[PDB]
Symmetry: D2
Subunit: 84 residues, 4 copies
């Protein structure tokens, strides 16, 4: 096992760019802790991210798109809450 | 149900950049046909790409890193052979 | 003599990823009007974007980093005011 | 006093921003404090020509396609003025 983050994004909305960006922000700072970050096309304004099935971000629910710093923290807390 | 691709890459070699680029190339061309494209951290200068377990590229096997068009043709023949690019 | 957009970014801060991301977003939706988008490494902790010398974003001033939505907008006002 | 700048001209409708942006990052993540800037210049007619202070270090036609990371990194390195 190892954590697997998945970013689901609306293709037509043209959110691949940012999906790919956030995927690299993660794989950069957590290159040794993550098993894999997946990019998953979707439709109708979908933009959701989860870690091992746990939602750590969702467009309408969190007000838009995450700051790299925030998503990092939420992935951090998800893996080891007490790891700086 | 849709086919998935996995680009396993050596992080220390600093190949995330490539892996990401190729994942994006693939996703913009097969947005309606790819289940998902994964970026997988690894080591020892590994750079292998799978399309549902089936290898379509392996650094030492194909002499380096694939080209945009070539990887597209491979994924294509794999999922949609009758499709033109 | 088309408009230039430069994004000055702090390299040690590992902000190249977001600078290249925002670059691509601009080149994406303004592919036919921008002469080019430049990425300029700054030795200091900066992140400011100018359009033909006119600053359109500054980390400290504008509160952080911009959302693609906002940036696209400010650049729109700066060059082609009549767009959606 | 005037650090070298790289320009990557690419055909837009060919959908080459990606491979041009990718290369741009490849250079900046390797030559952070050695390059003044790396510019992405939209173009047409399947053009792809990279310059380093005017000095073309690659052009799709002449060079036969698109550069490797290794290569362009080496051709940019060969221009740093020691």
């Amino acid at each position: 096992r190892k954590p697997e983050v998945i970013i689901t994004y609306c293709t037509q909305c043209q959110w691949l760019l940012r999906a790919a960006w956030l995927a690299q922000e993660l794989l950069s700072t957590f290159s040794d802790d993550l098993g894999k970050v997946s990019l998953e096309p979707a439709t109708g304004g979908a933009f959701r991210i989860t870690c091992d099935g746990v939602q750590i971000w969702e467009r309408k629910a969190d007000g838009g798109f995450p700051e790299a710093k925030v998503l990092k923290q939420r992935v951090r807390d998800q893996i080891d809450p007490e790891r700086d």
